[PDB]
Design a protein around this motif. Structure first.
Motif, mmCIF file in Angstrom:
data_model
loop_
_atom_site.group_PDB
_atom_site.id
_atom_site.type_symbol
_atom_site.label_atom_id
_atom_site.label_comp_id
_atom_site.label_asym_id
_atom_site.label_seq_id
_atom_site.Cartn_x
_atom_site.Cartn_y
_atom_site.Cartn_z
ATOM 1 N N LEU A 162 10.015 0.117 9.885
ATOM 2 C CA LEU A 162 9.370 -0.724 10.885
ATOM 3 C C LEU A 162 9.106 -2.096 10.284
ATOM 4 O O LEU A 162 8.514 -2.197 9.210
ATOM 5 C CB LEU A 162 8.047 -0.110 11.336
ATOM 6 C CG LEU A 162 8.090 1.294 11.940
ATOM 7 C CD1 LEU A 162 6.707 1.688 12.438
ATOM 8 C CD2 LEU A 162 9.102 1.388 13.069
ATOM 9 N N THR A 187 -3.572 -2.946 15.429
ATOM 10 C CA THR A 187 -2.298 -2.353 15.012
ATOM 11 C C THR A 187 -2.409 -0.824 14.936
ATOM 12 O O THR A 187 -3.290 -0.241 15.569
ATOM 13 C CB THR A 187 -1.854 -2.943 13.654
ATOM 14 O OG1 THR A 187 -0.505 -2.546 13.363
ATOM 15 C CG2 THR A 187 -2.791 -2.503 12.525
ATOM 16 N N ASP A 188 -1.515 -0.192 14.165
ATOM 17 C CA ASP A 188 -1.534 1.260 13.917
ATOM 18 C C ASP A 188 -1.463 2.201 15.114
ATOM 19 O O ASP A 188 -2.350 3.031 15.329
ATOM 20 C CB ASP A 188 -2.722 1.649 13.024
ATOM 21 C CG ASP A 188 -2.312 1.947 11.593
ATOM 22 O OD1 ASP A 188 -1.735 3.030 11.352
ATOM 23 O OD2 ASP A 188 -2.593 1.116 10.701
ATOM 24 N N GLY A 202 0.803 -1.217 0.000
ATOM 25 C CA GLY A 202 0.000 0.000 0.000
ATOM 26 C C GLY A 202 0.833 1.263 0.000
ATOM 27 O O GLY A 202 2.057 1.211 0.128
ATOM 28 N N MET A 260 0.386 -9.647 8.141
ATOM 29 C CA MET A 260 -1.009 -10.020 8.357
ATOM 30 C C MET A 260 -1.648 -10.168 6.976
ATOM 31 O O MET A 260 -2.236 -9.218 6.459
ATOM 32 C CB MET A 260 -1.720 -8.952 9.190
ATOM 33 C CG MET A 260 -1.047 -8.667 10.524
ATOM 34 S SD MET A 260 -1.112 -10.068 11.659
ATOM 35 C CE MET A 260 -2.784 -9.897 12.277
ATOM 36 N N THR A 302 7.246 -5.741 10.970
ATOM 37 C CA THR A 302 6.251 -6.454 11.764
ATOM 38 C C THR A 302 5.859 -7.746 11.086
ATOM 39 O O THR A 302 6.198 -7.987 9.931
ATOM 40 C CB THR A 302 4.956 -5.640 11.949
ATOM 41 O OG1 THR A 302 4.436 -5.265 10.666
ATOM 42 C CG2 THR A 302 5.211 -4.400 12.779
ATOM 43 N N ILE A 362 6.760 -4.447 5.959
ATOM 44 C CA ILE A 362 7.859 -3.495 6.120
ATOM 45 C C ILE A 362 7.368 -2.099 5.761
ATOM 46 O O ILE A 362 6.959 -1.859 4.627
ATOM 47 C CB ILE A 362 9.043 -3.865 5.208
ATOM 48 C CG1 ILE A 362 9.527 -5.285 5.508
ATOM 49 C CG2 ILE A 362 10.180 -2.864 5.369
ATOM 50 C CD1 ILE A 362 10.350 -5.893 4.393
ATOM 51 N N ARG A 369 -10.427 -0.392 10.211
ATOM 52 C CA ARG A 369 -9.274 -0.189 9.328
ATOM 53 C C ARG A 369 -7.922 -0.449 10.020
ATOM 54 O O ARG A 369 -6.951 -0.831 9.364
ATOM 55 C CB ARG A 369 -9.361 1.225 8.718
ATOM 56 C CG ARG A 369 -8.120 2.095 8.784
ATOM 57 C CD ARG A 369 -8.509 3.566 8.810
ATOM 58 N NE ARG A 369 -8.891 4.002 10.156
ATOM 59 C CZ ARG A 369 -9.666 5.051 10.436
ATOM 60 N NH1 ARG A 369 -10.187 5.797 9.467
ATOM 61 N NH2 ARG A 369 -9.939 5.353 11.702
ATOM 62 N N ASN A 370 -7.871 -0.246 11.337
ATOM 63 C CA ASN A 370 -6.655 -0.485 12.131
ATOM 64 C C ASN A 370 -6.695 -1.803 12.914
ATOM 65 O O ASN A 370 -6.027 -1.952 13.942
ATOM 66 C CB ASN A 370 -6.401 0.688 13.088
ATOM 67 C CG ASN A 370 -6.118 1.991 12.357
ATOM 68 O OD1 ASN A 370 -5.495 2.005 11.295
ATOM 69 N ND2 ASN A 370 -6.574 3.097 12.931
ATOM 70 N N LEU A 388 -6.073 -5.816 11.853
ATOM 71 C CA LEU A 388 -5.601 -6.644 10.749
ATOM 72 C C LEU A 388 -6.001 -8.098 10.950
ATOM 73 O O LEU A 388 -6.307 -8.525 12.072
ATOM 74 C CB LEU A 388 -4.083 -6.525 10.580
ATOM 75 C CG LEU A 388 -3.542 -5.111 10.308
ATOM 76 C CD1 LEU A 388 -2.022 -5.134 10.225
ATOM 77 C CD2 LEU A 388 -4.141 -4.499 9.048
HETATM 78 C C1 LIG Z 1 -4.644 1.302 7.549
HETATM 79 C C2 LIG Z 1 -3.916 0.579 6.412
HETATM 80 O O1 LIG Z 1 -4.209 0.827 5.242
HETATM 81 N N1 LIG Z 1 -2.979 -0.307 6.826
HETATM 82 C C3 LIG Z 1 -2.225 -1.019 5.959
HETATM 83 C C4 LIG Z 1 -1.729 -0.507 4.752
HETATM 84 C C5 LIG Z 1 -0.934 -1.308 3.930
HETATM 85 C C6 LIG Z 1 -0.601 -2.613 4.300
HETATM 86 C C7 LIG Z 1 -1.070 -3.136 5.506
HETATM 87 C C8 LIG Z 1 -0.779 -4.393 5.907
HETATM 88 C C9 LIG Z 1 -1.157 -5.531 5.295
HETATM 89 C C10 LIG Z 1 -1.862 -5.743 4.165
HETATM 90 C C11 LIG Z 1 -1.646 -6.946 3.477
HETATM 91 C C12 LIG Z 1 -2.347 -7.240 2.307
HETATM 92 C C13 LIG Z 1 -3.281 -6.339 1.806
HETATM 93 C C14 LIG Z 1 -3.511 -5.144 2.480
HETATM 94 C C15 LIG Z 1 -2.813 -4.848 3.653
HETATM 95 O O2 LIG Z 1 -0.693 -6.533 5.999
HETATM 96 C C16 LIG Z 1 -0.031 -6.067 7.053
HETATM 97 N N2 LIG Z 1 0.599 -6.739 8.033
HETATM 98 C C17 LIG Z 1 1.234 -6.045 9.060
HETATM 99 N N3 LIG Z 1 1.192 -4.662 9.028
HETATM 100 C C18 LIG Z 1 0.538 -4.039 8.031
HETATM 101 N N4 LIG Z 1 0.541 -2.703 8.003
HETATM 102 C C19 LIG Z 1 0.778 -1.842 9.185
HETATM 103 C C20 LIG Z 1 0.322 -0.447 8.789
HETATM 104 O O3 LIG Z 1 -0.487 -0.007 9.876
HETATM 105 C C21 LIG Z 1 2.140 -1.841 9.573
HETATM 106 C C22 LIG Z 1 3.168 -2.303 8.732
HETATM 107 C C23 LIG Z 1 4.498 -2.298 9.156
HETATM 108 C C24 LIG Z 1 4.818 -1.821 10.423
HETATM 109 C C25 LIG Z 1 3.806 -1.360 11.263
HETATM 110 C C26 LIG Z 1 2.476 -1.373 10.843
HETATM 111 C C27 LIG Z 1 -0.072 -4.722 7.023
HETATM 112 C C28 LIG Z 1 -1.880 -2.327 6.317
#
Ligand SMILES: CC(=O)Nc1cccc(-c2c(-c3ccccc3)oc3ncnc(N[C@H](CO)c4ccccc4)c23)c1
Ligand SMILES: CC(=O)Nc1cccc(-c2c(-c3ccccc3)oc3ncnc(N[C@H](CO)c4ccccc4)c23)c1
Lengths: 303, 303
Positions: free
Chosen positions: A93, A159-160, A24, A98, A95, A49, A146-147, A149
């Protein structure tokens, strides 16, 4: 004085992980899907990441580290935890991946195959996560569908933590100033006075449940955020979702009481939704779980 | 003399059914998806509706009626039956809709989720259907994965009786002349002498199984039909599919013996595949039923 935070901030080398694809992008920066491969072990860990951008704003770089602080300081099955950071040009970051993305998008593009068991179980897991953050003295300040996962359809995590704040032992509320917080998920006292508490999170939990029960509807869909203050003061709340028994909708309504202490505690929400999860079709009515005169040809024997 | 065929040919009005969509087209004409609604009853029957074309070739119109004759004369859970015809400009054949289409296409676009249980069960059902047609004294002459349809993933039926022929009581074989029959599914004696028998169908059954076991591979993929006669005479046969134990592949090979009577009867094929269906993973090895060092982040606790 207070309990010393002995969380470990793990610093990871860039060569240890591989970006497979972008997940994203937008205002927050960009998130990648990748594999982390610790050199010593014989393991490959699917990871998300996150980095900001090619530029480095002084105020923005500080805030990603604040997000790392909180994620590193949490350990719970229903909360997303920081694996480490990587100190490249801009800090990254890392993590746990998900894979199924955010719950908001998941309820939207799986309406037709989401049963009452899944909805009420998600409500239990989110309450458990939020309850853990309350024990850890943390106020999330941005709880929304939205926050949250999805690791698997039956396991979700919060998360978030970009807006999260840690409260002291002799401290019941956080006072914001900067603002710019999603208005349609926050309590009236937060909109009016910038007051945030564990009970302010309960309001947001209420709204998050509404999102799930409506399969990802936008709260106050046709209303600008300027008016939200007024309508809440008048006593107007989010409507009862079609699938919601008065039982479930009463829980949601209690999260949106003007008196914050009159709202339920997360530990109580765990109990109530857990009870309901034992007999889920008693509390949510979903027609699954274009004609009814249709009959297959071999149950229609020739007259 | 012979048993009188007392099958009923039901004539249906065009106003009784509605074409929803076209399903396919080509040399055979066009097939539609539709609902048949008998005026008297309170029922709606999903049906496939087949017609030729805007033109009416004398020889072609006769042959659709021959196809109706045979389909009207069969009644078995593993055989497709004619519901009726409609006498429009060009005659229409109405049958039960088989929503999942032909089995050839089904094994192709579901490779990854087709287990040994399903494959061996399909083999049992096709053998039951073919055995029924043998009791009914019918030689299909065009048995292939493409002419087996899927009502549900666990229920298949034989169809496409355009080449089928009814044998007399004092008659063991049919002698063709016209030709133009799919060569890669027919027995050597049929290619060499235009001889078709119930045992010729067994050869074709053998090839049909090969298609299923290879998840829809084209038999003799890189060979023109002119050479097929030669290579069969030499002793060359279709190769052993990766998933096939010698047990299953021995069945397939026996269907392709030069001596027709040395091939198994359909009733024997029902038994053998049925036995195998009780312990399916003993007879077909499928890896389902890009790394193995992968581990989820919460089964990797921080060292
Ligand atoms: C709010 C939002 O749009 N969050 C978001 C954006 C982009 C990716 C992810 C995300 C996904 C994901 C996987 C497939 C399709 C869509 C989204 O999977 C994830 N797994 C762990 N963290 C994610 N994102 C958070 C962002 O809040 C995050 C990533 C890295 C470090 C900290 C937080 C994610 C989550
Ligand atoms: C060999 C071939 O291509 N057959 C074919 C062609 C077009 C449609 C069908 C068919 C389907 C179908 C449904 C969805 C996707 C693809 C195919 O479903 C069917 N159900 C019953 N009969 C079918 N067709 C046969 C043609 O052999 C048929 C139709 C009407 C009367 C007699 C036979 C069918 C079958």
């Amino acid at each position: 004085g207070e309990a010393p935070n002995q969380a470990l901030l793990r610093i990871l080398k860039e060569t240890e992980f591989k970006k497979i694809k972008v997940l994203g992008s937008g205002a927050f920066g960009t998130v990648y899907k990748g594999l982390w491969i610790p050199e010593g072990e014989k393991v490959k860990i699917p990871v998300a990441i996150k980095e900001l951008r090619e530029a480095t704003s002084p105020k923005a770089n500080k805030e990603i580290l604040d997000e790392a602080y909180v994620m590193a300081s949490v350990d719970n099955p229903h909360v997303c935890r920081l694996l480490g950071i990587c100190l490249t040009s801009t800090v990254q970051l890392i993590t746990q991946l998900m894979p199924f993305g955010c719950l908001l998008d998941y309820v939207r593009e799986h309406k037709d195959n989401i049963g009452s068991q899944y909805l009420l179980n998600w409500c239990v897991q989110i309450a458990k996560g939020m309850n853990y953050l309350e024990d850890r003295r943390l106020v999330h300040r941005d709880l929304a569908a939205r926050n949250v996962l999805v690791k698997t359809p039956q396991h979700v995590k919060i998360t978030d933590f970009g807006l999260a704040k840690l409260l002291g032992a002799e401290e019941k509320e956080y006072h914001a100033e900067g603002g710019k917080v999603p208005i349609k998920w926050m309590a009236l006292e937060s909109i009016l006075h910038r007051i945030y508490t564990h009970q302010s999170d309960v309001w947001s939990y209420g709204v998050t449940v509404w999102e799930l029960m409506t399969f990802g509807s936008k709260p106050y869909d046709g209303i600008p955020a300027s008016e939200i203050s007024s309508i809440l003061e008048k006593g107007e709340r989010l409507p009862q979702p079609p699938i919601c028994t008065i039982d479930v909708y009463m829980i949601m309504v209690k999260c949106w009481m003007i008196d914050a202490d009159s709202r339920p505690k997360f530990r109580e929400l765990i109990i109530e939704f857990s009870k309901m999860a034992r007999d889920p079709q008693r509390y949510l009515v979903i027609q699954g779980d274009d004609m009814d005169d249709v009959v297959d040809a071999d149950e229609y024997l020739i007259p």
